[PDB]
Structure formats: C-alpha cells, structure tokens
C-alpha cells in the first residue's frame, strides 16, 4: 500500500478512472526522482505472492570457483581462455568476483576493480592482465542495458497497481493474473535478498554511465547481472502480453539452469532453439479444421505481384506431413538436463488440433519465453573464433582443366568435367552484356561511380567491375533476389497445398575463397569484358599489357584493355587474403594483426555478389547436378518442374524455395526429404554447408509464418536490453526518450495487450522525465506529440483513442478535431470564457487554458533537437535552450496546425470488411486484442527526397524538370510538400485503398459551396486525404468511411495559409 | 452537424460493421468442420 499512498492520483489517471492532467504528471515525476535503490526492494517486500510462483531456486548459483583455471596467455602474449565444453566456449564464464574489489568512497558496501591490479597489468604482470581482462569483460557484460533495472521494475509496480481494466469494445473487464501470480518477480526478490542477506541496502549492483559497482559479498557472481535483466523482461511480458504462466515458469527455469551452468551466455547459445523446435516445428500432427488464406502470385513471377482471393477452410489431408522431431528434440533436453521442460512442451503441443487464434497465440507465447540477451565476448576471441574457419572442397577442379596464366589469371577451358563451367558462363555472359551497355562509357557516370588492412574497435577503388557485374546478375539475368513484399511471399509459401524449404548458408563470409569461386569469377570477368572494351580506359586506371600462356603453342604480348587491368591488380589481392588488426580495450597488452581468407562483416558490395553466387549455384543444382545423381523418378520429375525464376528467393546467405501444390493435393513429403539429402550432398562438393530445414513453416529474413500467420518474435529485441560494443560512455540524458519511444513503437508491431501496454508505457514515460541540472522536466503533452496515445482527458470516455494515431502535427490535428466540442465545454466548465468566438474553439480562451495547462510548452518543447550537436558546456547550452521553451508563454500553435484546424469531417457509416474475421491473419491479435483486430479487418493488411521536396515547393508556389510542371504523383508523394508522411505504424496495413476510395472529398448531400477546391492548386486534395484519414485511424474501433463537411475559411483561402508557410519555409 | 467521440458511437459503428459482414452470402453458408453427412 506504500505505492498507493505515494502515487494515489496518478494510477487512476492512467487506468481510465480519472482525467489525465499535467500537475499530477509533474507531481509524480517529482517523486520518481526521489527513490533510493533500496526503496524498490522495500516495495517488492510487501506484495503477497501465491503458491504458483514458488519454485526451487538451486543453491549452486552463489558458489562458483574463481577464474584462475579459465584463462591463459597464448604465445605472442595475448590472453585467451581454455574451453572445457566445446570449441565455442569462448564467452564469459561464471566465477566468484568479490576478491578483485576495493570499495568506493561515500558508501562502503560497493566496490569496483582495484587500481593496483590494473597498474601491474599495464606494467606487464602475468596474473594482473588476466584479472583485469575478466573484470573489464564482466563490466561489459553487465553494462548491456538501457537504464537501471530498478526504474523498470518500479514502472511495472506503478502501472500494474491499478488492477484489471475495462474494455470499451468487449464491454467487460479483462482477466489477467496479478502480481501474486508472477514468478519472475518472486525470483527477482529472492535472489536479490539472498545475495545481501544480513547486510542492508540490498542492490546487487548499481548502474552508471562509465562502469558499474559490485556489492561486496561472497554471494556475488558474474551470472547475476545478465540473469536479472533476463528476469525483468519476462516479468514485464507476463503482464503486458497475457502470457500463460505455465510457459513463463519454464522460461525462468531455463534461465536458472543457465545461471547454474559453467557459463551463462554459452548455455543460452546452445539452448536458444528449444521453444521453436518443440512448439513451432511440431505443430498440427492431427489437423481437423480452421481457415487459411488463398493467395496466388501473378504470372510474371519476377514482379512479385500478389493477390488475395478469399479464404478457404482446411481439410484433413493438410496435416504435418514433414518428418519427425522427437529423436533430436528429446536428445537436446537429455544432454542439458531439460527433459522436464522438453516433454512438458511436447505433451502440451500435442493437444491443439484446429487452426484458430488460440493455437496461434500458443506459438506466440511459447516463442516469447526465449531469453533475449546480447552475447558478450572480447574481440580478440571474436576474431579467432570467426575468422579462423575455412571451407573444405571435397571435389576440387583438376589441374588439367586450366591453361597457363594470362598475367595473373588462368583461364578455364570449356571442356572441363567439373561443375565450374556453369559458374563460369553466367559471370562471362554477365560481363559481356554489361560491357555492351552504352551507360558505362560516358565520363559522367564513371565520375558518379567514383563518388591495405581493415580493423575494428583502399579496396573500393579497384574492385569496381566485380560489383558492377554482380548487379547485372541480380537484376537482369536471374531475378530471384528481392533486394515490403517479403510478407506475401511467405504467406503464399506457408499455405496448405504448398511447402517451403528454409535454405540457409552457414559462414557466408568464410564461404568463397580463391580455391573454387574467386578464381573462376576473376577468369570470367577478365574475358567477358575484353571483347567490348579494347584499349578504352576506365575512370583512372589506364590500358596496359601483360604476357600470356593461354595456348601452349607460343607466347605473345596481347594488350590489356584497362577495365580488366583492375582485375589484374585485384586478383593478386584476392589471391593471398586479407589483413586485420585488433585492439580490445577489454584486455591490455593485446594488440596484433591477423591474416585470413574471410571477408569483412557488414559491407555493401559483399552482399550483392554473394546473392548472385547463391542464385547461380542453385540454378545449376536444379539443372545439371540434380538429374545426374539420383534414381527414384518422382524426385527427377519434381526437380524438372521448378526453376529459380519461378520458386527461389534469396537476399543474403539464406534462401527460400517453394514447392507448390499439384492437382492431387500436396507433394509427397518423402521425395522432398530425398531432395534435401541431395542439397546437403551438393554443398559438400564445393564448400557450402547448408542449413536446410523442412517442418511445414517458412523462415525468410528471420520472419516466422505457419499457415500464413505473421508470428512476431517478442524476444527478437528485449525491452531492457541495449547493445554496447565499446567501453565508452553513452550520450547524455535527454536522448534516452528516443529509446523509450523505440520500446513503445516496437511494442506496437507485436500485438501486445494494448491497454496494459499503453498503461506501462505511461509509467516508463513518467519515470524518464526529470533530471538534475530548478530541474529539467518534460510535460506530458511533449510525449503526446511523439506518438503516444492517451487514455482519458478533458472529461471524455476512458480508453478512447488508439496508438495507430500518427505523430507530429498530423497527430495533433486528429484527436483535437475528434474531441473539440467536448473540450470547448470543459474549458467553460471552469471559468475560461472570453467574449469573442473563435472559429475553432468558440467563446473559450484557448490561449490561457493551454498556457496554464502547459500544452503549448510541451508542443513546442518536443520539437527541440534531442541531439547535443557539435563538452559539458554544450550540454548546458542545450539545457538552457530547453528551459527557455518552458519559461516562454505562447500564443497559438504552429501555422500548419492552425491552418489544418479549419477542416471538419464526419463519420457517416462504416465500410464493408476487407478480410474474414475468422481467418487468422496475424499472430497475437484476436478478439481478445480488440482494437488491432478491428482495425486490421476494417482496413486490410498490405497484400498486393530533398529533390522531390524542393521541386514541389517551387512547383506549388507560382513559378524531368520539363515533365514535373504539369503531371501529378500520388497522394503520399504529392503531400510531402508540407512534410506529411505515412507513419511507421501504418506500414503493416493498406493505406493505398483507404486513400484512393474511402476518403471522399465531397459531402454526402452534394456540394456545400464552402468546400470548393479551385481548378488551380489541385495539390490540396493530397493533403486533405491525409487530414481525412487521420481521424479515421485514431478513433478506436472500426475504421469508418469519412466524408468532407466544412472548411471554415473557404477552400480558396485555406491553401493561401499553406502558401504563407511555404514562403516562410 | 458535428459530433464528439463516444462509446455509444463506437458500438453504433461496430454493430453496422458486423451486420454488413454477417449478411455476406459465403459467410451465411460456409463452416470450418464438415459434418457426418459431408464426410460420408
């Protein structure tokens, strides 16, 4: 009841009881700063926890032997570790930490890494370097969070103290088990007490910007700061997603086994595939009913033009025909002591037999229980684990099938017996067809395309034509790459009559070397180019000459073109390998160089040619190697029916192959497996280790579908998790609100329990609002500007708007234009009357009412830059600039919003539905999740810049460049002149049909003579579409057909205000 | 003329939406699970 006595009037404001106000928000944010870290645990001590949260915490977490037997010093005097279980055991171990600590001043209980050990480590002691290595990597593992965990737990305690809520759609309360039935918080209380024990102040570590501090006790190990950040995510998601606690207990039990393990991160790396393997890879052993979508993609299949044509019910024959899972899924649990989890998952998975929202939410709640942490290891072991592997070529190409060198390039004779001639001819034809294009020869395009080692904390001048011919393969020869349209691909590929095969290439960077790929490619590009380009130079490299021994008869001189001169200078770079250089700040005295054959991680041109190399080898698989290496003419007939233009999609290493349904039903699911074995056999002959998968689902670009499902991965991103690669301090305070809004907008796209999710977003939003510098403080309207919907304001109905409302001025237009005749009543309801009537708010002084309630100051204060742009004195400059907006009193809104507010719309009648209600389109959303379920059916799911700004700025004002003057573009492009954009939230919906048809610019009773757009300045229609479709999406419930009603100043004088804003810029 | 947003108006929209969906002819007949006559 302590939180109740502390936060009485705020919880009723964000639970729909009382109206939200600025003074209650600021009086809460006054108190959010005034919390000790012990106060959160004092608040956790009072909640009565039920019997179904209690489970045995093991005693072996707290007693771990120290780190002396874990690390060693390699030759060349770099620190490593010796692995005990597996060669990938290179992560942070779990040992006793307290012996390497000396206490901070001003408080005795908390210590840090001692300065004598880092002094002797900089001096060059053997043990001290190991000790400071372990200390810095434990700090870096503990640091991977957005904010201190006690603030998140306190926001949970504030938000979930209002009890159950009420639904204005379902007209009933919700049934979600409260804090007494929440096992991660019981464990979070028990661990943090048992660490302290008799000692008070009870916070196992505190979090600062540069470094952490550890509680000085023998009970403290390194596994605890990732474990607590792991438990807080489940404690939040059990509330705001409506998870079943019978899955959350397994999700906590696996994390307790992870903390009890030899290492935490390594155990989670080895156990990250328990929940999808037992649940998602094993669905519907017996299928009896349910609805499935009916897509098809149109016949030019490279276009990826899709079409939704109704939904049909399933039949008995579309069960899981894929092979079994038990022999390895039970083995994974038996190796690690999780058979009580694996069998528990399998027996519960075997009870669902119909395809509806229930069995889909089962998959969502099972996938949510994986632990999303960020794996932390030193760069000096990241390199020497990742960059030391190599491909193995079981069938190399013989020395007879090469001639002598043309300079530094041997050519491949076409009478070879190996498969590499099919790789050779595609790159050869690609080079020969890109060299004949006229665009590659004017000097301006060469200047445009103009416009040693590498390390980690000049290849792009000479490696041009490799990339330039990779693009030709990706976009003209075999259009299998989709380099927004990935969704209907998988919704077709997951349908009942067709299957899908999830092909992934392991180690795409270590994949291709000079042994098989780069030699044939640099032999093909050196020959396809030299026909068209003879003597003509490139950008900056000249023509040249080099001797050859192509034919064995004689040798001669044979002048080099100049475009193949780069191939000459670049194949000697590819022939030897790459040179890297490292220096981790996590272990001193560790600074060396290293020679590999692998590629850099995240370059741009390293994706396109890998995609070309994917599609080419898949095409020669399906054409040549396929029929030549199999019996069983069902497999032969299956192979001879599909090609990569018709069914193969690849974007990186991974690919997706689709096997459509025949007339007799689905394809026999045993010949597909016989072809899978041939894919795995095919990869061994030239070094690729495929990660093929066949279960009945579709995985492409890490999106999970089953029967066309849109399953979100809740643990793809955690809530309290943030990546940190270096050891540097982070940005200052007023930029944390961008990540808090990121938490909210990432919770939008996943179908959380929306009343719970908005209510928890308010608690975070009010917790991150005040900072010492009079202190700085954002009012609650500054967050409403950032896209955060509200609950109950100005004396309205509770839970009245939706989080599909946009941000910015288009967002501020909509809810005001919906609530305005109630707001102008509430102003007069307490002494806010003036004599003149405004055309918007009437006889009430909106200026004084908004100044006293600080709505104006939030509106203009949210537009300040949160970036401390190029020192603490610049931070003080930004703070004074931010305080000046709060001290200044304001007169009105911006000219754009005031020009918007003259437009009035109407909600006549609801539109006919766009998709079936009983069809499960998307996971998590159902009639229990009422508002997205209404919006997505009423609208429909998406199943089908400075130049563009400024030329419209000069075109709409009175003034390609000859084309733009008279044409028009669509609404989403023409209405970017007033900086209006379709928001991030509407991307998974159909805004095109809504803009084109169901926003009418004409009243239902004809033409009111006030809404007369002139024939001149017809660009206004494209903005009135957005102003119409705002309120038709912000209002919760069904998206309604909306008609124009009134423009107060006239349609001619409406756009003159927009033209004044365009002159004022 | 104008109107504010009210839960009354929300329910008024939802009932019209469900009625216009319910009176669709494929929806009036189709079902997910076949019966003992259709299976025979």
């Amino acid at each position: 009841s302590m939180i109740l006595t502390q936060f009485g009037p705020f919880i009723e404001s964000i639970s729909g009881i009382t109206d939200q106000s600025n003074d209650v928000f600021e009086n809460a944010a006054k108190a959010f700063s005034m919390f000790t870290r012990s106060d959160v645990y004092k608040a956790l001590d009072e909640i009565p926890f039920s019997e179904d949260a209690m489970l045995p915490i093991p005693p072996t977490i707290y007693t771990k032997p120290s780190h002396d037997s874990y690390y060693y010093i390699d030759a060349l005097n770099r620190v490593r570790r010796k692995t005990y279980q597996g060669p990938d055991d290179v992560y942070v171990p779990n040992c006793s930490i307290v012996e390497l600590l000396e206490p901070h001043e001003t408080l005795t209980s908390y210590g840090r890494l001692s300065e004598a050990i880092e002094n002797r480590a900089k001096d060059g002691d053997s043990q001290a370097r190991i000790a400071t290595t372990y200390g810095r990597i434990a700090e870096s593992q503990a640091r991977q969070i957005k904010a201190p965990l006690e603030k998140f737990v306190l926001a949970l305690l504030v938000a979930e103290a209002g009890g159950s809520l009420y639904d204005p759609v379902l007209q009933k309360y919700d049934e979600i088990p409260g804090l007494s039935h929440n096992c991660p918080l019981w464990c979070f209380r028990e661990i943090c007490r048992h660490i302290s024990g008799p000692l008070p102040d009870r916070a196992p570590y505190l979090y600062l910007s540069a470094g952490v501090f550890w509680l000085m006790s023998p009970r403290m190990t390194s596994a605890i700061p990732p474990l607590l950040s792991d438990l807080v995510n489940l404690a939040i998601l059990q509330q705001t997603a409506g998870l079943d606690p019978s899955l959350v207990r397994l999700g906590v039990q696996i994390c307790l086994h992870a903390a009890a393990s030899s290492s935490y991160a390594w155990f989670i790396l080895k156990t990250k595939s328990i929940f999808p393997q037992n649940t998602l890879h094993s669905m519907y052993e017996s299928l009896e009913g349910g609805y499935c979508p009916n897509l098809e993609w149109l016949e030019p299949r490279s276009d990826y033009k899709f079409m939704y044509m109704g939904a049909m019910p399933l039949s008995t024959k579309y069960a899981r025909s894929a092979p079994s899972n038990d022999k390895k899924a039970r083995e994974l649990g038996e190796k690690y002591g999780l058979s009580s989890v694996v069998s528990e998952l399998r027996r519960r998975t075997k009870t669902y037999s119909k395809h509806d929202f229930t069995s889909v939410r089962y998959i969502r709640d099972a996938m949510a229980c994986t632990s999303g942490i960020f794996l932390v290891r030193t760069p000096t072991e990241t390199v020497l684990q990742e960059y030391t592997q190599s491909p193995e070529i079981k069938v190399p190409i013989p020395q007879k099938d090469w001639t002598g060198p043309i300079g530094e390039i041997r050519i491949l004779k076409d009478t070879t017996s190996s498969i590499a001639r099919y790789l050779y001819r595609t790159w050869y034809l690609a080079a020969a067809r890109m060299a004949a294009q006229p665009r590659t020869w004017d000097p301006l395009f060469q200047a445009i395309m103009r416009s040693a080692d590498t390390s980690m904390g000049p290849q792009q001048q000479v490696s041009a034509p490799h990339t330039l011919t990779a693009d030709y393969i990706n976009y003209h020869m075999n259009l299998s790459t989709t380099s927004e349209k990935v969704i209907p691909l998988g919704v077709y590929a997951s349908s009942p009559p067709n299957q899908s095969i999830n092909i992934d290439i392991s180690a795409c960077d270590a994949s291709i070397t000079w042994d098989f790929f780069l030699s044939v490619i640099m032999a093909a590009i050196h020959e396809g180019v030299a026909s068209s380009s003879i003597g003509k130079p490139f950008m900056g490299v000249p023509a040249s000459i080099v001797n050859d021994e192509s034919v064995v008869g004689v040798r001669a001189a044979r002048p080099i073109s100049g475009m193949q001169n780069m191939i000459q200078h670049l194949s000697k770079l590819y022939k030897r390998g790459f040179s890297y250089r490292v220096n981790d700040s996590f272990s001193p005295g560790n600074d060396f160089t290293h020679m590999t054959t692998t590629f850099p991680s995240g370059s741009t041109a390293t994706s396109t040619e890998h995609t070309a190399n994917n599609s080419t080898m898949m095409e020669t698989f399906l054409t040549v190697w396929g029929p030549e290496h199999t019996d069983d003419p069902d497999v032969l007939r299956l192979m001879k029916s599909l090609t990569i233009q018709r069914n193969y999609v690849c974007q990186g290493d991974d690919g997706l192959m689709i096997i459509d349904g025949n007339t007799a039903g689905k394809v026999n699911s045993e010949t597909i497996q016989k072809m899978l074995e041939l894919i795995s056999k095919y990869g061994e002959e030239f070094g690729w280790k495929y990660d093929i998968a066949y279960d009945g689902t579709a995985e492409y670009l890490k999106l999970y579908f089953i029967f066309g499902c849109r399953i979100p991965n809740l643990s793809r991103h955690p809530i309290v998790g943030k990546e940190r690669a270096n050891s540097s301090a982070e940005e200052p305070w007023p930029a944390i609100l961008d990540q808090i809004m990121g938490i909210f907008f990432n919770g939008v796209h996943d179908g959380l329990q929306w009343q719970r999710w908005i209510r928890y977003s308010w608690a975070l939003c009010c917790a991150f609002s005040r900072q010492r510098t009079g202190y700085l403080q954002y009012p609650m309207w500054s967050f409403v500007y950032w896209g955060l919907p509200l609950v109950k304001v100005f004396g309205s109905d509770p839970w009245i708007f939706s989080w599909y409302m946009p941000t910015g001025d288009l967002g501020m237009y909509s809810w005001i234009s919906l609530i305005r005749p109630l707001m102008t009543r509430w102003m007069v309801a307490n002494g806010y009357v003036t004599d003149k009537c405004s055309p918007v708010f009437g006889n009430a002084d909106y200026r004084k009412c908004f100044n006293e309630l600080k709505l104006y100051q939030g509106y203009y204060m949210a537009q300040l830059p949160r970036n401390p742009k190029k020192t603490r004195e610049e931070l003080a400059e930004m703070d004074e600039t931010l305080m000046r907006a709060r001290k200044h009193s304001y007169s009105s809104f911006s000219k754009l919003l005031e020009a918007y507010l003259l437009v009035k719309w109407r909600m006549c009648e609801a539109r006919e539905p766009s998709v079936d209600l009983r069809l499960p389109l998307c996971a998590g959303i159902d009639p229990l999740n009422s508002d997205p379920f209404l919006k997505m059916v009423s609208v429909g799911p998406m199943l089908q810049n400075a130049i563009d700004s400024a030329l419209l700025r000069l075109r709409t004002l009175g003034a390609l460049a000859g084309k733009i003057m008279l044409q028009d573009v669509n609404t989403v492009q023409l209405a970017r002149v007033v900086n209006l954009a379709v928001p991030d939230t509407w991307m998974s919906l159909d805004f095109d049909t809504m803009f084109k048809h169901h926003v009418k610019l004409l009243p239902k009773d004809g033409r009111h003579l006030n809404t007369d757009i002139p024939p001149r300045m017809g660009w206004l229609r494209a903005i009135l579409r957005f102003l119409g479709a705002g309120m038709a999406m912000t209002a919760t419930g069904v998206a309604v057909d909306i008609y124009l009603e009134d423009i107060h100043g006239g349609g001619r004088s409406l756009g003159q205000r927009f033209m004044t804003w365009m002159r004022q810029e | 003329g104008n109107m504010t947003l009210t839960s009354s108006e929300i329910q008024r929209h939802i009932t019209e939406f469900i009625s216009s969906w319910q009176n669709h002819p494929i929806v009036q007949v189709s079902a997910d699970v076949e019966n003992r006559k259709t299976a025979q």
Partner: peptide, 14 residues
C-alpha cells in the same frame, strides 16, 4: 448517456 452506452383552462378541460 454513459450508462446508456454501458447498457445498449376550463374550456380546454371540458
């Protein structure tokens, strides 16, 4: 209305 939203002389006389 909110509750409803939850729910759903002499001669003249003679």
């Amino acid at each position: 209305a909110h509750v409803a939203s939850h729910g759903l002389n002499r001669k003249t006389a003679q």
